[PDB]
Design a protein around this nucleic acid. Structure first.
Lengths: 67, 80, 77, 203, 272
RNA sequence: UCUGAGAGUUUGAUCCUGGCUCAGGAUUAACGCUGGCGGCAUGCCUAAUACAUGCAAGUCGAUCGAAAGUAGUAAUACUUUAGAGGCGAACGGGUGAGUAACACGUAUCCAAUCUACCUUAUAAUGGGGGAUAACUAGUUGAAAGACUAGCUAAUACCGCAUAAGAACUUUGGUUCGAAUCAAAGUUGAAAGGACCUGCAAGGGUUCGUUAUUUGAUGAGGGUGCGCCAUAUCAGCUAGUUGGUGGGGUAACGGCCUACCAAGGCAAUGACGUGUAGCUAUGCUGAGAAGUAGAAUAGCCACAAUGGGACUGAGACACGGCCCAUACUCCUACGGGAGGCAGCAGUAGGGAAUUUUUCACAAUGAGCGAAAGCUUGAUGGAGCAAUGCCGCGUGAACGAUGAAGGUCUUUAAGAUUGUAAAGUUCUUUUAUUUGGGAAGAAUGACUUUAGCAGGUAAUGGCUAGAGUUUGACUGUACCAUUUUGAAUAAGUGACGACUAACUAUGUGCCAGCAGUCGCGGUAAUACAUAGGUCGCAAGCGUUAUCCGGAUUUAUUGGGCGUAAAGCAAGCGCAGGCGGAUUGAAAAGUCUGGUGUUAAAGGCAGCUGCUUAACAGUUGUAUGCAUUGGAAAC
């Protein structure tokens, strides 16, 4: 939201980058990618979100499965 | 005052009626819960006598308890 | 502003002009005593101190200190 | 969760009946095997000191249905008293209302006792209790005024009374009373309370 | 600026709560933000709210939906990438056929019979093709409608690796595309216009003068109906060219038809 | 005895120096998925950024004249005050920009202070004057207002009588800069209002006045200690360091002035710099301590910004004033008006921090004998899983285990799973019916009994009186109060640490990722289905404080090959320091005493559904005085 142009990663399968996508991130280091310590929350204001998972959909924000 | 909502409490204090409450006190005299009226208190009437000798009028409704302490029998009628 | 401040102004402005007059005449008495030393102006200041210190116009300490100083410097005359 | 849901499923992996033995012993057959489609030979490939500590703690709260925050509450309460804290805690472990009602011959299961207590059929010393976690104390009288004739469960428990010295009861008059603190020998001994109190210093 | 993009998206949030009928698209290829409007006054009032009500200052341009690319008659070239960048040797070499396929996308056919390329390298090379067509030497749009036929290759020792073959295949694809005179395809929308009588000749002359594919008449119950397969660029101002001539009493349906060959004039216009 | 649990991690391998990660807590917590509710609070930390609107601190007619209106034939009684006069306003609430220092806290000193309204204590509570307020009429404009001339009241203002008492002056009489008495010199005391009584005279009640002596309160002043880092910041300093006189503050004080000089501080770090409201304390550890100073409580600073003054006991006054600054708003354009770091609410920001909600029911504060008035304080109530505590979504029995599905891999079995079906029962909660609070054991209110100087009598006071006060609240909850399983469970992990794996897809790609690391051709590491396990209306993710980390190791580590010995010597200060005898005990221990508010916890008790929590009771660091101790 301020002037801090820094790296980040897209955690999870696929992506929803729009070259202007406003979304939320995650703080945490990744060992294999030096200089990168950031991610993107899947499903915040731009990202679609992924359902049908007993996995994340707690993280990687996605609505509770509907049946 | 203190306590909880639906659970009032107010420790009776012989405090200056012109200075705010919930602060430093020369001497705390008694306590009472106004929710359920049973008149439980820890009044002293020993240093309170000195306070009344040097004014120190407590809060508005303390005079009723003053009647129970019976100080009127020993404070106002003490010159005759 | 509020009406109460207006009433306080309407009062204390005139009370302050009155007090200014009293203080300036006390000042004039002090001046006349500074010109020459005599018992008549000593009595004048004696009266004025009681006129002004009676109310909040002049503090008791200030009046007592000034009269003590004047009578002390008079004691050598 | 307030309830484990399926209670025989709890005895599946544990291999211990919460009843005497009849929980998973007489329902058609005796299914005391651990669950899991991935089931295979497991004799010494899943048991450790940490694992046995978890097993003891798990069966301990399963016997009473204590939630984590209430578990820490009871831990602090038994900290408030001195002596051998493990055995004192175990004595407090019977201070549950539903556990006592089950042990008083007033409910065939502690689960039934809990659901009666929440329903409001119980009277604890002129005070109906809907929370079944209240702490017992010696010298407490209970009543079952009117919500007991329509309940066959409470009567069936009454005829199948339980003998206990730490409490007194007139099951034919629907009367119960907590008399004294319970004795360790009257209770199962496979549980080790020490390891859990060692495990509870993490605040 | 990208900050201007963000502030214009804030203005979009403000202006979409009143009437969200306007559509906004951020194209992944053309890039410029397309916003829909009714007419001159509608766009004007949107601009007025943007600059005065919202204090948002953004430049205004022209709508962006560009093209597709393909190429001419077939040819066959080879790719030899003997190279290295980082600490050791690298090499790869393949031989593929670059053939157009008018109605089919990427297609692979193998011609390895003498063991020139192991099956392990059959699949990566395909990907090397699938990424190589993405750029064109005229304006850079991806090349589609191509049939690829791998013929030969050479797997060497440890110097050989799969990505080296992919890069060699990419070189071959680009070289053959340069040789085989690439061409462009423009989007074409199918527009149907139904007018009682008034703008028969008007629309006829507009389509004939501007662009479009037409054939005569359709005579509906009491109206004249004309369907034109017209380039999507020709819709620029057509919404008001027809409406102004119709005094606001015009309507049509805009549906995308297909990509069609670009004439030489379009070849001269778009290039820098 | 208060009181202490680690795990993995280099490499052929082993430890070691030593880093890393998390297992644990906490959080104004934020976010995701979801989500009935009880009770306990709390609920801008971003922008002291800018704000509409309302309240936000006003009261007294028995202080005063008179005005307006009702009743009344009038007088007069009554209703309200335009205003004056008295008091509250400086309470209180909110903020943390500023401030790195008497500021907090703490012990004491004010031989150098003050402190209405409230304590003690006495002297009385007059004689007048002359004025204006309000109003009337005119002038200027739509108006706010402003200006001009006439009439007056006040417990208002100002002289005049005496001053009990004080204070000053002088003399005599005191004490280790002191305090007390006597005489004389001088000065200046009040204002009346209401009521009862009294033919009246006058007397009394009550309010108020004046001055006097004494509490308490609050403020000011004195220091010691405690109260960030920065030397890749060594000189600072001329009101500066002191002295004499004067002005001056409630008092001392270069606080300031005139004169006289040139010192003063600073290597034990001033100054400069950035970082800061401080404390009790919240949390983390057994603790030494760290964390931050939530909220609350005490203290200090501020009120759009810089000054300046204003009365008042008390302010340079959130919501008094002028100037100047900056802004905003209105102006029919001449001129004016104002300052939410008050309650909220509103705009921006962020991930985000709520109602312009109700009654002043209680409490409190203010004004007033009195009634009565104000009270965006206060108490509630609204909202939020934000934390805490607590409860349901069924329960009794119930099958070689219903149907389907899963694995096994067609075969059985298990498996989902007492979960299911089935019978029976129930209702806190969902929901109908009646009950249903204390909170007000207060406060008003007059007659009675009594007390009490008076007594002619009201009134001064204590024991009973009801007309008196509820938003909360026909509220929680409760008699199967109506019916009814009906009104309701997700989340993470499952290669190891870390208790949790099968089937399929899959091909170092897709992706997981706290670490070790997995996945390049059947992956118990990824993605799905099923299953397992753990917590649960919370579970997952992030940030940040700590434990773990004793990993800057007095407590509680080393310096040879790892990180560590200046290349060495002279080597000041300082630190450490041979023996014997004495005293003081400065240090030290210890006894007596005071202080260290409450609240925090530790423990007991009480009220809660045990419960968190609230109240009751005590528990303490530390400092000072005094008596000892003699080892060091």
């Amino acid at each position: 939201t301020n002037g801090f142009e820094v790296l980040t990663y897209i955690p999870g399968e696929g992506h929803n980058l729009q070259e202007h996508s406003v979304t939320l991130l995650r703080g945490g280091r990744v060992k294999d990618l030096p200089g990168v310590r950031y991610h993107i929350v899947r499903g915040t204001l731009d990202t679609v979100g992924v359902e049908k998972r007993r996995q994340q959909r707690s993280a990687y924000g996605a609505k509770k499965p509907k049946a | 005052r203190m306590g909880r909502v639906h659970y009032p409490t107010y420790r009776i204090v012989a405090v200056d009626s012109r200075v705010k409450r919930d602060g430093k006190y020369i001497a705390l005299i008694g306590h009472l819960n106004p929710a359920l009226k049973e008149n439980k208190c820890k009044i002293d009437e020993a240093v309170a006598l000195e306070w009344l000798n040097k004014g120190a009028k407590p809060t508005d409704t303390v005079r009723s308890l003053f009647s129970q302490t019976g100080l009127w029998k020993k404070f106002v009628e003490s010159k005759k | 502003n509020i009406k109460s401040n207006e009433k306080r102004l309407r009062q204390n402005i005139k009370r302050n002009l009155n007090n200014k007059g009293q203080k300036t005449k006390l000042k004039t008495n002090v001046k006349n005593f500074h010109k020459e030393i005599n018992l008549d102006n000593l009595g004048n200041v004696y009266s004025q101190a009681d006129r002004l210190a009676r109310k909040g116009i002049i503090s008791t300490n200030r009046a007592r200190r000034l009269k003590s100083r004047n009578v002390a410097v008079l004691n050598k005359t | 969760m307030k309830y484990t849901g399926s209670i025989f499923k709890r005895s599946r992996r544990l291999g211990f009946s919460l009843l005497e033995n009849n929980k998973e012993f007489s329902k058609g057959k005796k299914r005391k095997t651990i669950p899991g489609q991935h089931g295979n030979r497991f004799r010494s490939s899943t048991m450790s000191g940490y694992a046995q500590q978890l097993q003891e703690k798990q069966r301990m709260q399963y016997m009473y249905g204590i939630t984590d925050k209430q578990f820490r509450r009871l831990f602090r309460l038994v900290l408030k008293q001195r002596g051998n804290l493990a055995v004192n805690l175990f004595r407090v472990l019977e201070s549950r209302l539903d556990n006592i009602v089950y042990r008083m011959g007033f409910a065939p299961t502690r689960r039934s006792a809990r659901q009666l207590v929440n329903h409001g059929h119980v009277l604890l010393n002129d005070r109906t209790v809907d929370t079944p976690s209240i702490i017992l104390n010696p010298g407490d009288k209970v009543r079952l005024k009117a919500k007991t004739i329509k309940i066959p469960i409470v009567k069936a428990a009454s005829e199948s009374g339980v003998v206990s010295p730490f409490v007194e009861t007139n099951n034919k008059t629907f009367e119960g009373t907590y008399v004294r603190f319970p004795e360790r020998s009257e209770l199962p001994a496979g549980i080790n309370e020490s390891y859990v109190v060692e495990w509870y210093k993490r605040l | 600026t990208k900050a201007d993009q963000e502030k214009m998206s804030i203005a979009l949030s403000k202006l979409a709560e009143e009437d969200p009928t306007f559509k906004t698209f951020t194209d992944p290829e053309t890039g410029q933000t397309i916003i829909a409007g009714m007419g001159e006054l509608h766009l004007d009032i949107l601009v007025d709210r943007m600059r005065r009500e919202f204090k948002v200052e953004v430049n205004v341009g022209a709508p962006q939906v560009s093209f597709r690319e393909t190429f001419n008659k077939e040819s066959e070239v080879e790719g030899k990438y003997i190279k290295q960048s980082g600490g050791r040797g690298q090499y790869g070499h393949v031989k593929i056929r670059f053939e157009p396929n008018k109605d089919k996308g990427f297609e692979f056919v193998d011609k390895i019979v003498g063991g020139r390329i192991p099956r392990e390298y059959i699949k990566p090379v395909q990907a090397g093709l699938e990424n190589a067509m993405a750029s064109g030497p005229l304006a850079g749009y991806p090349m589609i409608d191509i049939k690829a036929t791998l013929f030969d290759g050479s797997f060497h020792e440890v110097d050989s690796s799969e990505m080296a073959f992919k890069i060699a295949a990419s070189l071959a694809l680009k070289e053959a595309g340069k040789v085989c005179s690439p061409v462009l395809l423009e989007p074409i929308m199918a527009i149907e216009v139904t007018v009682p009588e008034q703008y028969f000749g008007d629309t006829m002359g507009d389509i004939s003068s501007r662009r479009g594919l037409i054939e005569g008449t359709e005579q509906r119950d009491n109206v004249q109906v004309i369907k034109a397969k017209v380039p999507l660029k020709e819709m620029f101002g057509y919404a008001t060219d027809l409406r102004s001539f119709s005094q606001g009493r015009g309507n049509y349906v805009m549906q995308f038809s297909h990509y069609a060959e670009t004439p030489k004039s379009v070849v001269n216009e778009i290039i820098a």
